[PDB]
Design an enzyme around this catalytic site. Structure first.
Site, PDB file in Angstrom:
ATOM      1  N   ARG B  13       0.822  -1.236   0.000  1.00 48.37           N
ATOM      2  CA  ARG B  13       0.000   0.000   0.000  1.00 48.37           C
ATOM      3  C   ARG B  13       0.852   1.280   0.000  1.00 48.37           C
ATOM      4  NH1 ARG B  13      -5.231  -0.379   1.407  1.00 48.37           N
ATOM      5  NH2 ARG B  13      -5.012   1.297   2.963  1.00 48.37           N
ATOM      6  N   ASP B 142      -2.463  12.261   9.658  1.00 44.74           N
ATOM      7  CA  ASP B 142      -3.871  12.011   9.342  1.00 44.74           C
ATOM      8  C   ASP B 142      -4.597  13.362   9.173  1.00 44.74           C
ATOM      9  OD1 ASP B 142      -6.653  11.443   9.474  1.00 44.74           O
ATOM     10  OD2 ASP B 142      -6.207   9.573  10.539  1.00 44.74           O
ATOM     11  N   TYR B 155      -6.471   5.430  18.194  1.00 44.36           N
ATOM     12  CA  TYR B 155      -5.844   5.802  16.947  1.00 44.36           C
ATOM     13  C   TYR B 155      -5.649   7.330  16.798  1.00 44.36           C
ATOM     14  CZ  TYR B 155      -5.459   6.795  11.989  1.00 44.36           C
ATOM     15  OH  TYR B 155      -5.097   7.339  10.786  1.00 44.36           O
TER      16      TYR B 155
HETATM   17  N1  LIG Z   1      -5.320   4.749   4.039  1.00 41.50           N
HETATM   18  C1  LIG Z   1      -5.810   5.926   4.412  1.00 41.50           C
HETATM   19  O1  LIG Z   1      -6.851   6.323   3.879  1.00 41.50           O
HETATM   20  C2  LIG Z   1      -5.123   6.778   5.482  1.00 41.50           C
HETATM   21  C3  LIG Z   1      -5.742   7.895   6.018  1.00 41.50           C
HETATM   22  C4  LIG Z   1      -5.104   8.690   6.974  1.00 41.50           C
HETATM   23  C5  LIG Z   1      -3.800   8.404   7.385  1.00 41.50           C
HETATM   24  N2  LIG Z   1      -3.193   7.290   6.870  1.00 41.50           N
HETATM   25  C6  LIG Z   1      -1.847   6.916   7.321  1.00 41.50           C
HETATM   26  O2  LIG Z   1      -0.966   6.701   6.230  1.00 41.50           O
HETATM   27  C7  LIG Z   1      -0.040   5.614   6.578  1.00 41.50           C
HETATM   28  C8  LIG Z   1      -0.173   4.476   5.581  1.00 41.50           C
HETATM   29  O3  LIG Z   1      -1.551   4.111   5.406  1.00 41.50           O
HETATM   30  P1  LIG Z   1      -1.965   2.619   4.979  1.00 41.50           P
HETATM   31  O4  LIG Z   1      -3.437   2.598   4.752  1.00 41.50           O
HETATM   32  O5  LIG Z   1      -1.105   2.200   3.850  1.00 41.50           O
HETATM   33  O6  LIG Z   1      -1.538   1.822   6.318  1.00 41.50           O
HETATM   34  P2  LIG Z   1      -1.952   0.314   6.740  1.00 41.50           P
HETATM   35  O7  LIG Z   1      -2.131  -0.431   5.458  1.00 41.50           O
HETATM   36  O8  LIG Z   1      -3.095   0.274   7.695  1.00 41.50           O
HETATM   37  O9  LIG Z   1      -0.730  -0.223   7.552  1.00 41.50           O
HETATM   38  C9  LIG Z   1       0.562   0.087   7.102  1.00 41.50           C
HETATM   39  C10 LIG Z   1       1.432  -1.043   7.623  1.00 41.50           C
HETATM   40  O10 LIG Z   1       1.519  -0.833   9.015  1.00 41.50           O
HETATM   41  C11 LIG Z   1       2.224  -1.948   9.533  1.00 41.50           C
HETATM   42  N3  LIG Z   1       1.919  -2.281  10.939  1.00 41.50           N
HETATM   43  C12 LIG Z   1       0.669  -2.393  11.438  1.00 41.50           C
HETATM   44  N4  LIG Z   1       0.716  -2.767  12.733  1.00 41.50           N
HETATM   45  C13 LIG Z   1       2.001  -2.972  13.027  1.00 41.50           C
HETATM   46  C14 LIG Z   1       2.712  -3.357  14.227  1.00 41.50           C
HETATM   47  N5  LIG Z   1       2.060  -3.687  15.367  1.00 41.50           N
HETATM   48  N6  LIG Z   1       4.022  -3.392  14.150  1.00 41.50           N
HETATM   49  C15 LIG Z   1       4.711  -3.075  13.055  1.00 41.50           C
HETATM   50  N7  LIG Z   1       4.129  -2.690  11.931  1.00 41.50           N
HETATM   51  C16 LIG Z   1       2.791  -2.618  11.867  1.00 41.50           C
HETATM   52  C17 LIG Z   1       1.692  -3.157   8.691  1.00 41.50           C
HETATM   53  O11 LIG Z   1       2.730  -4.071   8.223  1.00 41.50           O
HETATM   54  P3  LIG Z   1       2.473  -5.650   7.790  1.00 41.50           P
HETATM   55  O12 LIG Z   1       1.466  -5.589   6.691  1.00 41.50           O
HETATM   56  O13 LIG Z   1       3.868  -6.049   7.295  1.00 41.50           O
HETATM   57  O14 LIG Z   1       1.985  -6.422   8.993  1.00 41.50           O
HETATM   58  C18 LIG Z   1       0.937  -2.481   7.537  1.00 41.50           C
HETATM   59  O15 LIG Z   1       1.267  -3.114   6.306  1.00 41.50           O
HETATM   60  C19 LIG Z   1      -0.475   5.136   7.958  1.00 41.50           C
HETATM   61  O16 LIG Z   1       0.427   5.686   8.929  1.00 41.50           O
HETATM   62  C20 LIG Z   1      -1.905   5.625   8.139  1.00 41.50           C
HETATM   63  O17 LIG Z   1      -2.319   5.850   9.506  1.00 41.50           O
HETATM   64  C21 LIG Z   1      -3.804   6.522   5.925  1.00 41.50           C
HETATM   65  C1  LIG Z   2     -10.761   8.504  10.866  1.00 43.13           C
HETATM   66  O1  LIG Z   2     -10.360   9.350  11.665  1.00 43.13           O
HETATM   67  C2  LIG Z   2     -10.107   8.307   9.548  1.00 43.13           C
HETATM   68  C3  LIG Z   2     -10.566   9.013   8.473  1.00 43.13           C
HETATM   69  C4  LIG Z   2     -10.039   8.804   7.205  1.00 43.13           C
HETATM   70  C5  LIG Z   2      -9.035   7.796   7.035  1.00 43.13           C
HETATM   71  C6  LIG Z   2      -8.574   7.109   8.170  1.00 43.13           C
HETATM   72  C7  LIG Z   2      -7.534   5.996   8.124  1.00 43.13           C
HETATM   73  N1  LIG Z   2      -6.472   5.868   8.880  1.00 43.13           N
HETATM   74  C8  LIG Z   2      -5.848   4.688   8.553  1.00 43.13           C
HETATM   75  N2  LIG Z   2      -4.703   4.305   9.154  1.00 43.13           N
HETATM   76  C9  LIG Z   2      -4.153   3.113   8.796  1.00 43.13           C
HETATM   77  N3  LIG Z   2      -2.962   2.622   9.429  1.00 43.13           N
HETATM   78  N4  LIG Z   2      -4.752   2.371   7.818  1.00 43.13           N
HETATM   79  C10 LIG Z   2      -5.878   2.788   7.205  1.00 43.13           C
HETATM   80  N5  LIG Z   2      -6.370   1.911   6.202  1.00 43.13           N
HETATM   81  C11 LIG Z   2      -7.798   1.918   5.732  1.00 43.13           C
HETATM   82  C12 LIG Z   2      -7.909   0.672   4.924  1.00 43.13           C
HETATM   83  C13 LIG Z   2      -7.172  -0.246   5.741  1.00 43.13           C
HETATM   84  C14 LIG Z   2      -5.943   0.517   6.075  1.00 43.13           C
HETATM   85  C15 LIG Z   2      -6.496   3.998   7.561  1.00 43.13           C
HETATM   86  C16 LIG Z   2      -7.590   4.888   7.315  1.00 43.13           C
HETATM   87  C17 LIG Z   2      -8.728   4.749   6.366  1.00 43.13           C
HETATM   88  N6  LIG Z   2      -9.587   4.650   5.629  1.00 43.13           N
HETATM   89  C18 LIG Z   2      -9.150   7.370   9.401  1.00 43.13           C
END
Ligand SMILES: NC(=O)c1ccc[n+]([C@@H]2O[C@H](COP(=O)([O-])OP(=O)(O)OC[C@H]3O[C@@H](n4cnc5c(N)ncnc54)[C@H](OP(=O)(O)O)[C@@H]3O)[C@@H](O)[C@H]2O)c1
Ligand SMILES: *C(=O)c1cccc(-c2[nH]c3nc(N)nc(N4CCCC4)c3c2C#N)c1
Ligand SMILES: NC(=O)c1ccc[n+]([C@@H]2O[C@H](COP(=O)([O-])OP(=O)(O)OC[C@H]3O[C@@H](n4cnc5c(N)ncnc54)[C@H](OP(=O)(O)O)[C@@H]3O)[C@@H](O)[C@H]2O)c1
Ligand SMILES: NC(=O)c1ccc[n+]([C@@H]2O[C@H](COP(=O)([O-])OP(=O)(O)OC[C@H]3O[C@@H](n4cnc5c(N)ncnc54)[C@H](OP(=O)(O)O)[C@@H]3O)[C@@H](O)[C@H]2O)c1
Ligand SMILES: NC(=O)c1ccc[n+]([C@@H]2O[C@H](COP(=O)([O-])OP(=O)(O)OC[C@H]3O[C@@H](n4cnc5c(N)ncnc54)[C@H](OP(=O)(O)O)[C@@H]3O)[C@@H](O)[C@H]2O)c1
Ligand SMILES: *C(=O)c1cccc(-c2[nH]c3nc(N)nc(N4CCCC4)c3c2C#N)c1
Ligand SMILES: *C(=O)c1cccc(-c2[nH]c3nc(N)nc(N4CCCC4)c3c2C#N)c1
Ligand SMILES: *C(=O)c1cccc(-c2[nH]c3nc(N)nc(N4CCCC4)c3c2C#N)c1
Lengths: 250, 249, 250, 249
Positions: B13, B142, B155
């Protein structure tokens, strides 16, 4: 029946003034403390002399650990035990010391600074809500300088930022249960007599409103406001009580 | 000599896109992962097939515990051991799931959500600094932290602390020439397996195109911040959210 | 003797509630109004019936123009004329309507929306300061939704941001004179019959704290706090009174 | 054919640096100016020497008045007239001087400080939208808005207003594919003419290198925001401040 409040870190300084002021307003109070047992008991004595059976003490370490949830739940439980109810929670307890990035281990620094300033307030808020005419609220003691932080206090600053995050999240989620969640963000307040007179005056001069730290009573006035019937639509709000300190550039 | 970067949670991702894009720019990369071992290994292969000896993996749980300091120090060590230097740290790994105020224990929820999102970043930051040109740390924040998801209070607390670390570390590490910034996504890469009405609901609120960000769009903001075009920028967080945080209830 | 307050846009709704509560706490009041002359006069009449000659009215368009500085100066004047002093200024009047980016001319839209919401508050603030146990303070009516703004209300939203800036700048600058400057930021309050029912229902339902609007008296409570002796170290602060509305995501 | 940019107050200092970089990136540019006629034409000459027919000047006073909407519409019109299109608007022009609360009339102070810093940008943005690809606006904000200079209340009010526009306009103009963002300098390019001691006073406060930003550093951030690496960024404001805004009193 008189409502009841829990104030953490209430044995002295700003927590004490908060507990006194809530008692003066009609509350029964749980004075929580960690190491200051003499000050806590002496405060509870003065309050109970004023009104019988309206103050108790409750000892707990709020350092993060695997038993911290049970400790927080027992603080809440002590308020119900003593007074049959718990209307107000004030999260005032806080560790405060530098943690430079470059004799406590870092594990301990983490547990103390993050535990007291954020995880304990979260678990206390859980326990407060779970345990529940009424005016239910939580007041978190935040920090007005959170965005212009003290050099080398990164774990403290992280903990206070997390506390704002809890204030918001909890106000949001506890609104349907009628529980309001807000903060009071002190600037410099009640400098310890200990501290050098030259260092204290250094801080004082920076404060626009009166070149002086806040009294403890001044912080406490803001808390009393947020728990009152005068704030019944207010939730998720953080009131700076800083004499304009946070408005002053470098 | 080519600079080196650590990227946490880099197997999949956004973390993956971040590692690839740094690699494409010339970085050697440490791919950190927790459970996604195959994906981490397949990514290192793919990068090393492009340029040899430019990618390695390093496994670690970033849950808060009495051994987290040492694991974080080893993640940084793994970059020095492989590449002789460490110029960039990207704090991307994150646990994410609900924690209602009213079957993991709560202390485990605490450990995981505050550990991944804040404490690990602080420890990694300490170890990175302690070992020290264009040095910089980028923290994945975030954009929605002030209008948070219902029942995600741990979170959100973790993400708030991460902004605090971003500011504090930027301030403290500036005399070393280490910049510390953040990138704040809105919604990005919504998983295929989430509900269609659910995803649609989020996508529709996004003013800029009614869609989520791709992972590459997030990675772009990272690249900029590590680049020579960001030499004066420290303590800043770039929202990359299509205007989502601007939209009222 | 009794302090005195100026309240802008005080004839109706939140401004009237503010003026009434200040009067109840013992202030003499200048009720400023623009078009609502019948309500303004009635209000002063009711207040004077309660305590003789404790209320005056003063009419002024607060649209931006070459005469706005003298209008603002005459408003402050009017409080010194009536009551010999001016302790409190509440900037409450506000034009509010959409100004889409893509039949008033746009320069009139600018003049009204930026005038009432920002420039006039600045000019009243200058005139208030130039005329100056004492407790002097300014309270500016802001907007809790300023970072998540209404679609097509650019000039309104620009005005309110500017008011936040004034709040902060004036608190800094006027602190050495003992004048505090703060704000109160409503969410939704007192949505009138005139507004679309659909639109009203959409807002009220999103409010976490009780799925309803603030009453005028709820907003006024926060104003009374800020001008009170319990806020004597607070300056540069903005208190949301929004029921948690600004915490709710899209 | 090449895209085109309007840059307000582009004759000197940071606006000039922004115009130059957009031009080096391939844009055609309208160099707007108010009094610096000579520097402005001198700069258009130099840009056209490098690539002919790629730079025009446009003079306008951006003080608030009943004709300000017309003058703003003419600045955008000047871009379509010279180049047949208008892809980027950069709102950089700005009045800056003290207006204490306690020879210029106050009505003139209000007009200049609120006109240049907010109203003109609002009307430029209206005209930009109505006359309409990677379309975007960048507003030059101020990283010190919440810790302002003493006695700069009308200035600070204007820059706050500009934050609010950035947000409102990002929201409203997103469905037309126009992104709206800001760059917030701390201290940058202090006047060579301003006292050395005063200058060193500000320079000493900056954590990252105890120096002010170069004009080029500010422009780098602008360039990023208009580029294809920022396609999902709208309503964001990037501080380029070396950590200045993080330093407490
Ligand atoms: N996706 C969104 O819409 C969104 C929105 C706001 C902020 N963010 C931030 O952007 C960043 C990336 O987002 P994402 O959606 O790609 O993240 P994600 O898929 O939820 O997780 C990123 C990676 O975090 C690692 N991780 C989780 N728990 C762990 C633990 N206990 N120890 C070590 N590593 C751990 C995992 O590695 P493994 O797979 O190898 O276990 C996972 O692949 C994050 O920091 C997230 O909070 C994302
Ligand atoms: C809530 O406050 C909120 C609003 C928009 C997006 C997120 C968000 N944070 C996430 N953090 C991590 N580590 N992973 C995800 N992924 C969503 C799909 C699975 C992994 C996050 C999201 C989302 N959507 C939080
Ligand atoms: N003082 C200021 O200038 C200032 C500025 C900004 C914000 N604040 C915030 O305002 C609040 C009150 O400030 P203050 O100066 O009065 O606070 P303080 O004296 O630093 O701390 C108050 C109490 O916190 C308790 N505490 C410390 N570590 C603990 C632990 N491990 N477990 C349980 N309790 C613990 C202590 O109890 P025992 O004494 O019983 O051990 C202490 O009396 C704090 O949250 C603070 O962060 C203060
Ligand atoms: N209602 C809400 O939910 C809400 C939400 C956010 C913020 N606020 C803020 O809180 C404050 C009060 O709200 P409200 O709903 O009570 O306000 P409002 O009724 O919309 O306006 C209050 C008064 O403003 C005066 N006013 C309008 N244009 C004027 C002009 N050119 N010159 C002088 N006065 C003028 C009017 O006086 P006349 O009637 O005498 O003409 C009017 O009664 C406002 O500042 C508003 O922006 C309210
Ligand atoms: N320099 C800093 O440290 C700093 C700090 C914070 C924010 N910023 C922001 O970044 C931007 C650029 O800063 P700077 O220092 O380069 O700016 P500046 O030199 O103060 O102003 C840039 C140009 O603004 C134009 N301008 C002034 N009044 C005008 C009017 N009434 N009508 C039309 N144009 C007018 C002037 O054009 P002519 O010369 O043609 O008359 C001037 O060259 C500004 O928006 C500023 O507020 C700068
Ligand atoms: C730095 O960021 C900062 C600036 C002003 C005030 C503080 C501050 N926070 C404190 N928290 C707690 N728990 N205690 C204190 N005390 C200082 C004297 C002993 C207790 C705090 C201060 C201060 N000063 C931090
Ligand atoms: C949009 O950004 C926004 C969101 C919530 C509430 C408001 C709002 N501001 C107002 N200001 C003034 N002066 N009056 C009103 N009234 C609405 C009913 C008539 C007067 C305001 C509202 C609302 N609703 C704006
Ligand atoms: C005060 O809030 C503040 C703090 C740091 C930098 C500035 C600042 N804003 C400026 N805006 C404009 N239009 N011009 C200048 N310069 C022109 C003369 C030299 C400075 C600004 C500065 C500065 N310094 C304000």
């Amino acid at each position: 029946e008189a409502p009841a409040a829990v104030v953490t870190g209430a044995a002295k300084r700003i927590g004490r003034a908060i507990a006194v002021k809530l008692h003066q307003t009609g509350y029964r109070v749980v004075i929580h403390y960690h190491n200051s047992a003499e000050a806590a008991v002496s405060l509870a004595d003065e309050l109970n002399k004023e009104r019988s059976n309206t103050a108790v003490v409750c000892q707990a370490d709020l350092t993060n650990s695997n038993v911290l949830p049970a400790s927080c739940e027992e603080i809440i439980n002590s308020c119900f035990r003593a007074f049959g109810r718990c209307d107000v929670l004030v999260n005032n307890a806080s560790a405060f010391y530098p943690t430079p990035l470059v004799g406590k281990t870092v594990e301990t620094q983490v547990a103390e600074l993050i535990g007291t300033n954020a995880i304990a307030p979260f678990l206390l808020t859980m326990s407060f809500a779970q345990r529940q005419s009424s005016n239910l609220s939580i007041v978190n003691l935040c920090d007005a300088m959170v965005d212009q932080p003290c050099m080398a206090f990164s774990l403290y600053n992280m903990g206070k930022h997390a506390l704002v995050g809890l204030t918001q999240s909890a106000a949001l989620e506890l609104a349907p249960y009628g529980i309001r969640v807000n903060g009071v963000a002190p600037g410099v307040s009640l400098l310890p007599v200990a501290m050098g007179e030259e260092e204290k005056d250094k801080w004082r001069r920076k404060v626009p409103l009166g070149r002086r730290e806040a009294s403890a009573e001044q912080i406490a006035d803001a808390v009393i406001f947020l728990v009152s019937g005068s704030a019944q639509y207010i939730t998720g709000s953080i009131i700076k009580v800083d004499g304009g300190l946070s408005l002053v550039h470098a």
